[PDB]
């Protein structure tokens, strides 16, 4: 749900063993077409 994964800091598993936000970039939806993907 972003929160931890997006923005610098936080350790939310998906923010602990995956992409880390260092930052000055701009952050910009599988609700459809993916109603039915590794997690690390």
């Amino acid at each position: 749900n972003e929160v931890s994964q997006i923005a610098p800091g936080q350790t939310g598993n998906i923010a602990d063993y995956n992409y880390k936000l260092p930052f000055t970039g701009c952050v910009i939806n599988s609700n459809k077409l993916d109603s039915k993907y590794l997690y690390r």
Partner: protein
């Protein structure tokens, strides 16, 4: 108004319940509660409005 004492305080068991839209704190930032040995915890639950 539940009183909580003598806990492991593993906040990893939470976040698997029903999907939530507000997780906002005051004075303490999340993902840190595994640290910070506290004194006691008061828990309340209610339904207010839509």
């Amino acid at each position: 108004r539940k009183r909580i004492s003598n806990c492991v305080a593993d906040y990893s068991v939470i976040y698997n319940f029903a999907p939530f839209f507000a997780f906002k704190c005051y004075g303490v930032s999340p993902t840190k509660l595994n640290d910070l040995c506290f004194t006691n915890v008061y828990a309340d639950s209610f339904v207010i409005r839509g």
